[PDB]
């Protein structure tokens, strides 16, 4: 139903992985790395950032049910991306996804003879995994992403091409870096991204003439207390991430 894929913090501590002894910190990486592998493959497969984001959410959700100890991220990412491309209508071929995943995971290694038994096996493994993903997610594949909501909001507040692009950037990075997707509705995450991008640009959105703050035009539930708590959490991890901030840093 509606609260099915949103979890309390307390629920996030008791994840399938913990259960099997994976520290919270360790688990987080595992996620960030899967998101990285997705981003890398997706770019070479030439699929949209939207499709990559979809596979990332699939991955996030998958691991609220399954454990990294049983299903390693290097196995799941390709299957997830394979699925997300089919769903987002940018289908990429099974053999092609296999190839690209191989070079990413094993840059030096040499692709197996497609005639081989070893290769036929990995083809079959991807298909099996896609099916385990479909079933774990219970066939719920339509994903709402913050980005839809970002665009709408950043137009309504007449942000510069720059501010808007920075907010879209925050959105994409929230998926790679955080479990916000498992906790907050996309529209709320969109507000968090726009807020942070403002802070980072020194931009301030003028309080409407009604005395209503912008986010109130966006989500009823949202409060500034929540926004500051969240932008802080997001900014912290951006700071840990080598070179990420450099990308939005005003070098002048």
């Amino acid at each position: 139903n509606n609260k099915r894929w949103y979890f309390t913090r307390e629920q996030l501590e008791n994840s399938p992985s913990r259960r099997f002894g994976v520290d919270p910190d360790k688990e987080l990486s595992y996620r960030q790395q899967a998101a990285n592998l997705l981003q890398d493959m997706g770019q070479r497969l030439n699929v949209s950032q939207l499709t990559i984001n979809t596979a990332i959410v699939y991955m996030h959700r998958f691991y609220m049910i399954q454990s990294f100890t049983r299903f390693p991220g290097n196995s799941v990412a390709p299957a997830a991306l394979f699925l997300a491309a089919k769903v987002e209508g940018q289908p990429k071929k099974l053999e092609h996804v296999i190839k690209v995943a191989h070079t990413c995971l094993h840059p030096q290694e040499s692709l197996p003879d497609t005639r081989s038994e070893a290769y036929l096996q990995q083809v079959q493994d991807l298909v099996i995994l896609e099916s385990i993903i479909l079933q774990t997610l219970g066939f719920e594949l339509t994903i709402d992403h913050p980005h839809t909501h970002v665009v709408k909001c950043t137009q309504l507040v007449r942000a510069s091409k720059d501010l808007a692009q920075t907010s879209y950037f925050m959105a994409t990075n929230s998926l790679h870096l955080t479990t916000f997707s498992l906790q907050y509705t996309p529209p709320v995450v969109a507000c968090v991204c726009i807020h942070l991008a403002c802070k980072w640009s020194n931009w301030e959105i003028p309080v409407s003439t009604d005395g209503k703050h912008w986010w109130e035009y966006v989500d009823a539930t949202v409060t500034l207390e929540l926004l500051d708590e969240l932008t802080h959490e997001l900014l912290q991890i951006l700071e840990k991430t080598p070179n990420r901030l450099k990308r939005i840093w005003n070098w002048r």
Partner: protein, 313 residues
Amino acid sequence: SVECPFCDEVSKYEKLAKIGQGTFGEVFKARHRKTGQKVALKKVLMENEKEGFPITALREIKILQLLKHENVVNLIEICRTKGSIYLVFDFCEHDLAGLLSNVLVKFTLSEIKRVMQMLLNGLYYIHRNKILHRDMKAANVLITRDGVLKLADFGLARAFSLAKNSQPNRYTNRVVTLWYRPPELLLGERDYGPPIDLWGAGCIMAEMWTRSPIMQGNTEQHQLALISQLCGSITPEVWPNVDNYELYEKLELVKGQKRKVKDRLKAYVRDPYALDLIDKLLVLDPAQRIDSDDALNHDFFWSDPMPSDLKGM
């Protein structure tokens, strides 16, 4: 074996009887083992399917999940097997193709009105939600034991979108059963929309009296011939710019024909309003063809005898 909270084994249902031997995939009537709830099972076919789970099935599932309406069949859940996959639907007692092909079964004008009303209402809903059904036919219309009509079989359905930028949509031309297929498609259109479903609505409406598909072509050319013998012949006068399919010439369509829609059906139908509505559904130019909204407003639904419930039968 592995954690699977949200995908139940289909064994929770007990198979009663096949009910779809030759219509697409195998379809079963079944019974929930605890509650007795009757449902329909459809297995997802895997005939290579060398590309994992069929992209076609993903599309249908996505669409079934989106569409929630009294006149649209309801996907309850998807079940695994322990390997296959099944779409589980609420069961519907009747099928309009069946009821119509049954000499015992009889409709009053009042009920026929009601049927058309529900059908048109279902179309209005799916279109409003940017979905084209693409397989309008009697056999894909169901009716529940309580007389509620449901649009079924979204296996060829597809989302659509508007314009844009003067770049035409390039949707698939190979859509819709031949007998129910609109002129546009037969003339090679790939930038079509909701009007194709309404053409089908027309064919079905007429079928409510004739008890048989009005235009049973054998090939596209035969179909186009039949359509011309009924709706007049395809003329840039009748259908502005029709002349610009690279298939206008190749078709070499008949050109003496004049519109006989109301004359040829005059016999069976009788009711003036019914004939008028059918005439406005079976219009050649998709752009002059009535839409579900206007159709629902048509005097056919607002004159005596007013539309009534499906009692008995």
